[PDB]
Amino acid sequence: PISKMVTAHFVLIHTICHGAWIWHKLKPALERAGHKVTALDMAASGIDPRQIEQINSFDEYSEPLLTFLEKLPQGEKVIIVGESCAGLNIAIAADRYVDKIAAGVFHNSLLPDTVHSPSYTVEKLLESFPDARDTEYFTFTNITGETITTMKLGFVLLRENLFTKCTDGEYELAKMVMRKGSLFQNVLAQRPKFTEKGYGSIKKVYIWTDQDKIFLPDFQRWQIANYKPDKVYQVQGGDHKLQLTKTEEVAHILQEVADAYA
Amino acid sequence: MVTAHFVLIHTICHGAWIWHKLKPALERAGHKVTALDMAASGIDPRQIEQINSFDEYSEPLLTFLEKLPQGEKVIIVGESCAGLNIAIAADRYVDKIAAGVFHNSLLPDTVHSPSYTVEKLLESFPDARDTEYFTFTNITGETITTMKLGFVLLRENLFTKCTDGEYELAKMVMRKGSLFQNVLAQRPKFTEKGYGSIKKVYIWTDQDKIFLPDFQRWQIANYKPDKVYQVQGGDHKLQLTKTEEVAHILQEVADAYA
Amino acid sequence: MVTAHFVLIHTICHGAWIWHKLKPALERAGHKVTALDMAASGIDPRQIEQINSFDEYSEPLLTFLEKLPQGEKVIIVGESCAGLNIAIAADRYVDKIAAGVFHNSLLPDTVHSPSYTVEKLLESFPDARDTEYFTFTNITGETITTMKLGFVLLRENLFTKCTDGEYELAKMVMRKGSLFQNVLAQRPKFTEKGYGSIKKVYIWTDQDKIFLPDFQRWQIANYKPDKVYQVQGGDHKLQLTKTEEVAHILQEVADAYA
Amino acid sequence: PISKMVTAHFVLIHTICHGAWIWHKLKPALERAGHKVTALDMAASGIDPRQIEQINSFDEYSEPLLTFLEKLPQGEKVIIVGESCAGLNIAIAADRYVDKIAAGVFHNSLLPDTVHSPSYTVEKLLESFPDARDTEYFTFTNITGETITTMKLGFVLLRENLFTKCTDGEYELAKMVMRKGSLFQNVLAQRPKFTEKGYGSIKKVYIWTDQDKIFLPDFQRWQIANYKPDKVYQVQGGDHKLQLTKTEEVAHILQEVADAYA
């Protein structure tokens, strides 16, 4: 009757162990459409110079995004797209910058809520997927004496579970740039719950595929049932890295989020 | 058809990632492929200000080679400035090297100092366009110049013909780097027994927009390779724009030198 | 008389060498003594420009403590700025620490930021005489100030009463160092459960010519120790000028806290 | 009839694994006498920032001394005092700066000659003392493919053989600052012989004690017999570190060298 088409500023957030590089196919697809796209490496990820053992919480890990948001011009708002564990970065960020956020998009992602502890979807995730195959774990003691478990994701888990359907060039790349990462689960467990006026108020779009071999369908559906998103988009096929296996489809869904909220 | 163990070496500011298309292609032919991050490159944790020479920058390669089991030999493939990593490596581990392959690369010699081809490259291409430079003093007091490669330079000169996904990946993981030109200017020349003796295969395209055809042609005249393969078209990053063509030449190098 | 395991921690720019008289004295009483070089100090191979905070500088202590066998506790003895290494350590490993001993040292608290006693020290002693300063940008962009301690300052203020052999040794192995003042200014305060809970013994002399008696007295009033021992005379380096007096106080600390 | 007393500029050179710090008692004793004293750390020794694996020859190891000598004012000459393996640093230096050297003093030191290979007294030394007790060895490959053996001197060998009679404060200090070191024997073996006009022409004073428990009396006497020094001074007692156990005696001998040659 009236048709709307909106250009938007997406801030793309990788999951633990990965970096901005995972968005190297979706960032151009989005810019072809005329959007502005920022893909940030979080602390100790991608080519960020910090080492994970110098990071003490998922909040500290989130520093690049929060600094970025501190610096957005007055009146500018972004759509934050986070994959896998980056839903926690979107919740940390929305409790600090709710007015700079047009919508949070969870892409095969943790969907934190305000009712339970910050670590709650992490517990549920680990319950749904308790074997990380060839992943190696390590520990360090943080600034207040908490022991932090880090992981070096194994190559079979990478091949089969996270990058199932990706090309060999994309699977080799992941192996060439993957870093250690941590869920910081135990400090998230001690963390104040996400707020209703910050995080609880942002618009939330949930993109997922039932072919995801690490954030499995029963888990994903549990999260959707646990904290109803404003909108759900299920992509058929692909794998956990839909920004690699369904790049264009994800860019078309993201155009729709920009039209509704940006 | 011989299967070989190839060790792929990226150029300054880049990392093992630049080989993410060529490593699976080689492996489809049954080759073993090792792709290393040099010091302060790709996801190596060291920062460029702690590296004091091009030989210290080469450490991942020299450690690798130090540990290769007895009787094993590798073909080292080096792009752009990595021709200097092949020559440093060949002088220390000549018996472990079946051949060196220069992929749009510097081709050092034994007659001039180690910085000679770096001098000539800068003469052929003196404007790095939007590249930024920085300096630090190394542990011995020498001033080292680092660069952060400009994105117009990346787009138009290095990744000229690359896809947008590839160029974008380049911007996302590019690190600072250094020619260590002045320490190379002070370094002993590469030896005739080490580097001078290895087999040398030169791969290039005249469509390369940073290692320009007359510099490449001067290099070949200055120190004639055992073989020169020229790929038509593509750009400076032939392992991305002509991946199967370089995998095929590299099969010819495994056949010839094992 | 209790034998204890003492971990001795030097101040910025110095190294484990400053304890070369006190380590044998303690061992004559059957104590176990570990004396560590902090990052970029004594013969540690790292350079100060690669260290980005006082917590990274503390790494040798935190690794040590990370590996102490279960059920073992240590008395950490820290001189001058090493009071900050004790507080960082006590927050991460409170159960491994029988007591902290401040030897003419900064005595951080929990109520103000980690840089508060550094601010007050500089206020009490703002002229470092012939000390030189340098800066570098750390990995996060903060400007770090380093110093090379001047020899008149070493002779007259730090090693005032020391023998000529000792002062000369100091000049021969002194390294650059940093207060990382501004990163400490940004650091979370020391916790009441970690650092706030440990036993704290303060050793000093009013003849100290860099940590002057009114700053030391302000520290004790600002955060009253469990015990304060005052040694008459000597100088700032009591582990060199009053070695047996500090070994004797430290026997009293092993007796009291094990 | 006429009595002479001379003030001189001594350049003190430590042995491999040690640093300028070993001279911390003799440097003040000499300055009490009015001499000028330089004590240098050689490459990868004392607090020199270079690591031994970046050093490729005893010549490269000798860089601090040669740079120093390049910089001496015209007409200035020094007496170089070298302990244990530092006789090779004195020979490397005298072939480059013979006119800046008033005399070489070998203090329980290797006494290189011009007739045999540079590595020859190193072979003889290792033959006289073949067991380095708890010393650990390591290897790296140098800039031309030679394998270099390095050593971390063991603590018993330090206690009993090198620092036999030193105080506990001096023995603990050595342990606190000792570094890896290398004889570079195999590259010395390939090295051109020291020259007769450089090294063969400098005055050479040999200080030693027969109580030295690592450069043993039969070895020392072999060296004295092998290449007759211009003057020999035998200190009674002490140990291998005579600059620590006989500091004043060594300073009085060194006053005599300054009167004869400086």
Side-chain angles (χ1 to χ4, degrees), chain A residues 47-60:
Chain A
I47 57 161
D48 185 274
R50 288 174 279 203
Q51 301 301 112
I52 193 64
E53 300 80 12
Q54 313 165 338
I55 306 304
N56 302 115
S57 64
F58 211 93
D59 287 74
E60 286 175 31

PDB file of all heavy atoms in Angstrom, chain A residues 47-60:
ATOM      1  N   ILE A  47      42.499 -11.242  14.986  1.00  0.00           N
ATOM      2  CA  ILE A  47      43.860 -10.740  15.088  1.00  0.00           C
ATOM      3  C   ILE A  47      44.049  -9.709  16.201  1.00  0.00           C
ATOM      4  O   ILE A  47      44.987  -8.865  16.186  1.00  0.00           O
ATOM      5  CB  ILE A  47      44.364 -10.104  13.728  1.00  0.00           C
ATOM      6  CG1 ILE A  47      43.441  -8.976  13.268  1.00  0.00           C
ATOM      7  CG2 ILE A  47      44.532 -11.247  12.713  1.00  0.00           C
ATOM      8  CD1 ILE A  47      44.026  -8.003  12.259  1.00  0.00           C
ATOM      9  N   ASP A  48      43.135  -9.770  17.191  1.00  0.00           N
ATOM     10  CA  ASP A  48      43.255  -8.892  18.345  1.00  0.00           C
ATOM     11  C   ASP A  48      44.517  -9.294  19.118  1.00  0.00           C
ATOM     12  O   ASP A  48      44.779 -10.487  19.291  1.00  0.00           O
ATOM     13  CB  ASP A  48      42.022  -9.026  19.223  1.00  0.00           C
ATOM     14  CG  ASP A  48      42.020  -8.059  20.389  1.00  0.00           C
ATOM     15  OD1 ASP A  48      42.596  -8.408  21.418  1.00  0.00           O
ATOM     16  OD2 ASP A  48      41.453  -6.966  20.271  1.00  0.00           O
ATOM     17  N   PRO A  49      45.357  -8.346  19.559  1.00  0.00           N
ATOM     18  CA  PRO A  49      46.667  -8.645  20.087  1.00  0.00           C
ATOM     19  C   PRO A  49      46.595  -9.238  21.481  1.00  0.00           C
ATOM     20  O   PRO A  49      47.593  -9.774  21.931  1.00  0.00           O
ATOM     21  CB  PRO A  49      47.401  -7.289  19.995  1.00  0.00           C
ATOM     22  CG  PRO A  49      46.302  -6.299  20.299  1.00  0.00           C
ATOM     23  CD  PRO A  49      45.211  -6.892  19.404  1.00  0.00           C
ATOM     24  N   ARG A  50      45.476  -9.115  22.220  1.00  0.00           N
ATOM     25  CA  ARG A  50      45.377  -9.596  23.602  1.00  0.00           C
ATOM     26  C   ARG A  50      45.296 -11.095  23.637  1.00  0.00           C
ATOM     27  O   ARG A  50      44.793 -11.681  22.673  1.00  0.00           O
ATOM     28  CB  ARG A  50      44.145  -9.026  24.274  1.00  0.00           C
ATOM     29  CG  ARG A  50      44.345  -7.558  24.564  1.00  0.00           C
ATOM     30  CD  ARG A  50      43.021  -7.097  25.086  1.00  0.00           C
ATOM     31  NE  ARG A  50      42.182  -6.853  23.936  1.00  0.00           N
ATOM     32  CZ  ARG A  50      41.131  -6.040  23.944  1.00  0.00           C
ATOM     33  NH1 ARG A  50      40.727  -5.383  25.027  1.00  0.00           N
ATOM     34  NH2 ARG A  50      40.507  -5.816  22.796  1.00  0.00           N
ATOM     35  N   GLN A  51      45.751 -11.725  24.718  1.00  0.00           N
ATOM     36  CA  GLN A  51      45.711 -13.189  24.819  1.00  0.00           C
ATOM     37  C   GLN A  51      44.596 -13.493  25.740  1.00  0.00           C
ATOM     38  O   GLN A  51      44.384 -12.705  26.651  1.00  0.00           O
ATOM     39  CB  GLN A  51      46.949 -13.772  25.430  1.00  0.00           C
ATOM     40  CG  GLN A  51      48.179 -13.381  24.605  1.00  0.00           C
ATOM     41  CD  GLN A  51      48.103 -13.846  23.150  1.00  0.00           C
ATOM     42  OE1 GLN A  51      47.992 -13.084  22.183  1.00  0.00           O
ATOM     43  NE2 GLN A  51      48.129 -15.139  22.957  1.00  0.00           N
ATOM     44  N   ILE A  52      43.958 -14.647  25.601  1.00  0.00           N
ATOM     45  CA  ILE A  52      42.749 -14.934  26.367  1.00  0.00           C
ATOM     46  C   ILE A  52      43.010 -14.951  27.874  1.00  0.00           C
ATOM     47  O   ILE A  52      42.177 -14.519  28.673  1.00  0.00           O
ATOM     48  CB  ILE A  52      42.153 -16.297  25.789  1.00  0.00           C
ATOM     49  CG1 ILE A  52      40.738 -16.474  26.315  1.00  0.00           C
ATOM     50  CG2 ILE A  52      43.027 -17.512  26.134  1.00  0.00           C
ATOM     51  CD1 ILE A  52      39.815 -15.345  25.794  1.00  0.00           C
ATOM     52  N   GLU A  53      44.241 -15.285  28.285  1.00  0.00           N
ATOM     53  CA  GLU A  53      44.572 -15.378  29.691  1.00  0.00           C
ATOM     54  C   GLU A  53      44.666 -14.015  30.380  1.00  0.00           C
ATOM     55  O   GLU A  53      44.690 -13.933  31.618  1.00  0.00           O
ATOM     56  CB  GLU A  53      45.874 -16.144  29.861  1.00  0.00           C
ATOM     57  CG  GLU A  53      45.853 -17.564  29.317  1.00  0.00           C
ATOM     58  CD  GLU A  53      46.049 -17.686  27.792  1.00  0.00           C
ATOM     59  OE1 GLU A  53      46.430 -16.708  27.143  1.00  0.00           O
ATOM     60  OE2 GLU A  53      45.832 -18.766  27.229  1.00  0.00           O
ATOM     61  N   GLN A  54      44.694 -12.927  29.592  1.00  0.00           N
ATOM     62  CA  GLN A  54      44.677 -11.574  30.129  1.00  0.00           C
ATOM     63  C   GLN A  54      43.188 -11.131  30.236  1.00  0.00           C
ATOM     64  O   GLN A  54      42.940 -10.021  30.712  1.00  0.00           O
ATOM     65  CB  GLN A  54      45.474 -10.627  29.172  1.00  0.00           C
ATOM     66  CG  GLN A  54      46.858 -11.146  28.697  1.00  0.00           C
ATOM     67  CD  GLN A  54      47.616 -10.499  27.486  1.00  0.00           C
ATOM     68  OE1 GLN A  54      47.060  -9.843  26.592  1.00  0.00           O
ATOM     69  NE2 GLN A  54      48.939 -10.661  27.359  1.00  0.00           N
ATOM     70  N   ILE A  55      42.139 -11.909  29.849  1.00  0.00           N
ATOM     71  CA  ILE A  55      40.738 -11.460  29.776  1.00  0.00           C
ATOM     72  C   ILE A  55      40.061 -12.110  30.964  1.00  0.00           C
ATOM     73  O   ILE A  55      40.382 -13.243  31.331  1.00  0.00           O
ATOM     74  CB  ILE A  55      40.096 -11.905  28.427  1.00  0.00           C
ATOM     75  CG1 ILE A  55      40.962 -11.412  27.270  1.00  0.00           C
ATOM     76  CG2 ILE A  55      38.675 -11.335  28.272  1.00  0.00           C
ATOM     77  CD1 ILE A  55      41.256  -9.897  27.198  1.00  0.00           C
ATOM     78  N   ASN A  56      39.184 -11.397  31.661  1.00  0.00           N
ATOM     79  CA  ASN A  56      38.677 -11.948  32.909  1.00  0.00           C
ATOM     80  C   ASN A  56      37.195 -12.173  32.977  1.00  0.00           C
ATOM     81  O   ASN A  56      36.731 -12.631  34.010  1.00  0.00           O
ATOM     82  CB  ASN A  56      39.013 -11.073  34.110  1.00  0.00           C
ATOM     83  CG  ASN A  56      40.486 -10.869  34.266  1.00  0.00           C
ATOM     84  OD1 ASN A  56      40.956  -9.751  34.140  1.00  0.00           O
ATOM     85  ND2 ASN A  56      41.311 -11.869  34.460  1.00  0.00           N
ATOM     86  N   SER A  57      36.411 -11.858  31.957  1.00  0.00           N
ATOM     87  CA  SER A  57      34.977 -12.035  31.983  1.00  0.00           C
ATOM     88  C   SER A  57      34.539 -11.878  30.559  1.00  0.00           C
ATOM     89  O   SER A  57      35.305 -11.332  29.756  1.00  0.00           O
ATOM     90  CB  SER A  57      34.295 -10.969  32.803  1.00  0.00           C
ATOM     91  OG  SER A  57      34.429  -9.648  32.293  1.00  0.00           O
ATOM     92  N   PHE A  58      33.307 -12.303  30.280  1.00  0.00           N
ATOM     93  CA  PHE A  58      32.686 -12.171  28.974  1.00  0.00           C
ATOM     94  C   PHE A  58      32.442 -10.687  28.720  1.00  0.00           C
ATOM     95  O   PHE A  58      32.438 -10.200  27.593  1.00  0.00           O
ATOM     96  CB  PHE A  58      31.376 -12.968  28.980  1.00  0.00           C
ATOM     97  CG  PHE A  58      31.048 -13.540  27.604  1.00  0.00           C
ATOM     98  CD1 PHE A  58      31.468 -14.844  27.287  1.00  0.00           C
ATOM     99  CD2 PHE A  58      30.378 -12.767  26.638  1.00  0.00           C
ATOM    100  CE1 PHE A  58      31.221 -15.352  26.005  1.00  0.00           C
ATOM    101  CE2 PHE A  58      30.144 -13.297  25.371  1.00  0.00           C
ATOM    102  CZ  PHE A  58      30.563 -14.587  25.043  1.00  0.00           C
ATOM    103  N   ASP A  59      32.266  -9.921  29.798  1.00  0.00           N
ATOM    104  CA  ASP A  59      32.171  -8.474  29.716  1.00  0.00           C
ATOM    105  C   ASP A  59      33.453  -7.846  29.199  1.00  0.00           C
ATOM    106  O   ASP A  59      33.399  -7.044  28.262  1.00  0.00           O
ATOM    107  CB  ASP A  59      31.843  -7.894  31.092  1.00  0.00           C
ATOM    108  CG  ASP A  59      30.387  -8.170  31.460  1.00  0.00           C
ATOM    109  OD1 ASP A  59      30.053  -9.317  31.784  1.00  0.00           O
ATOM    110  OD2 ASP A  59      29.590  -7.233  31.402  1.00  0.00           O
ATOM    111  N   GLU A  60      34.608  -8.249  29.750  1.00  0.00           N
ATOM    112  CA  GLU A  60      35.883  -7.749  29.268  1.00  0.00           C
ATOM    113  C   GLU A  60      36.148  -8.184  27.837  1.00  0.00           C
ATOM    114  O   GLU A  60      36.658  -7.399  27.034  1.00  0.00           O
ATOM    115  CB  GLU A  60      37.012  -8.228  30.159  1.00  0.00           C
ATOM    116  CG  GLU A  60      37.003  -7.474  31.494  1.00  0.00           C
ATOM    117  CD  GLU A  60      38.025  -7.958  32.534  1.00  0.00           C
ATOM    118  OE1 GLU A  60      39.101  -8.434  32.123  1.00  0.00           O
ATOM    119  OE2 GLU A  60      37.726  -7.863  33.748  1.00  0.00           O
TER     120      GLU A  60
END
